[PDB]
Homo-oligomer: A and B are copies of this chain.
Amino acid sequence: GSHMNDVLVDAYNIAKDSQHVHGVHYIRGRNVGEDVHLDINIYVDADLKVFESDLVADAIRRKIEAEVDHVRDVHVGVTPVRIA
């Protein structure tokens, strides 16, 4: 039936403990038929380079797509934060 709960938990848990993630900013799940479309946005250090943040988002995407059932069209966005 609904797979949202599993998708959101498993995806969040992947994102929150990936490298360079200071914390999850937001997560959004939308049901479309049997699929869940997922948008996650992660906080990263404002001083990270673009190439590095691009790799992080892509890794998180790859891992969610590999391990989380019922997911479609996963998007991982990044928000800079100043780290004291």
Contact = CB atoms under 8 A, between A and B. Distances in A.
Interface residues of A, number: 17
Contact of A31 (B13, B26, B30): B26
Q: How many copies does the complex hold?
A: 2
Nearest to A2: B16
Contacts of A24: 2, 4, 31
17 contacts: A2-B12, A2-B23, A2-B24, A4-B12, A5-B13, A8-B8, A8-B12, A8-B27, A8-B29, A9-B9, A23-B31, A24-B31, A25-B30, A26-B29, A26-B31, A27-B28, A28-B28
Interface of A: 2, 4-5, 8-9, 12-13, 16, 23-31
